């Protein structure tokens, strides 16, 4: 609703769409945490274990086809695993499969918002057949 001091994550939600967006963000963050942990831990271990006080002279390692294919193919699977829910979320933004109940024409000016509406209000007798039967038994006697 409103932001809070020392806040880290998103605000609270009032629609299912925004909660779906936040859940998608946290699902992406699931993969990002593992990616960053692997990079940072491997960088630390490579830094400490290959300092020149440990290493007399380096090794010749220019290519490794298996590891190259592995770190090419694992992130692409992560990309396609992320993409299909995001594609589903993009296409679910249109929700015109109900009867619309309200129109609001929002106009942005310098420097105030302006709000408009033009609808029609009509009334309908709530469950008239009970009243129809009441009139039936009021006219039969």
């Amino acid at each position: 609703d409103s932001p809070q001091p020392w806040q880290l994550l998103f605000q609270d939600t009032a629609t299912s769409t925004a909660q779906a967006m936040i859940d998608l963000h946290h699902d992406i963050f699931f993969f990002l945490i593992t990616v960053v942990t692997l990079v940072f831990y491997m960088m630390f271990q490579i830094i400490t274990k290959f300092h020149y006080s440990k290493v007399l002279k380096p090794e010749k390692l220019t290519h490794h086809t298996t590891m190259e294919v592995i770190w090419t193919i694992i992130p692409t699977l992560i990309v396609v695993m992320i993409a299909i829910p995001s594609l589903t979320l993009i296409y679910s933004l249109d929700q015109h499969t109900e009867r619309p109940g309200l129109t609001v024409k929002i106009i942005g000016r310098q420097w105030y918002w302006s709000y408009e509406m033009h609808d029609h209000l009509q009334h309908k007798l709530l469950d008239p057949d009970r009243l129809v039967g009441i009139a039936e038994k009021a006219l039969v006697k």
Binding site: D1, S2, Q4, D12, T13, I47, T48, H51, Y52, S53
Partner: protein, 104 residues
């Protein structure tokens, strides 16, 4: 690959090669970055103290205490008031506002 290393180490003699990861000792680095952080803090404090042309009335202690009396509550012009952000402040779903609660 080794000869360019030894050449760069001769044109940069102040860079030490002693057998440790942080070759420059921390007794040199920590006091100077501490002094730089202190100078940055002095500049930040000077900006906060002497470089403001309007301090908002919503940050005065009277406003703050009168706000802390109310809490995270929003008024409505067409309805009873409502607790703001009910998920992070753990309001249960039965309770919508302060006035509609009417505590037992």
């Amino acid at each position: 690959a080794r000869a360019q290393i030894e050449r760069w180490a001769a044109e940069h003699p102040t860079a030490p090669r002693v057998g440790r990861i942080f070759e420059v000792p921390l007794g040199y680095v920590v006091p100077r970055v501490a002094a730089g952080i202190a100078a940055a803090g002095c500049l930040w404090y000077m900006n906060n103290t002497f470089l403001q042309t309007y301090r908002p009335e919503s940050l005065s202690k009277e406003f703050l205490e009168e706000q802390a009396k109310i809490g995270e509550v929003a008024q409505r012009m067409n309805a009873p008031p409502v607790y703001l952000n009910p998920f992070t402040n753990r309001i249960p779903g039965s309770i919508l506002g302060p006035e509609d609660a009417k505590p037992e």
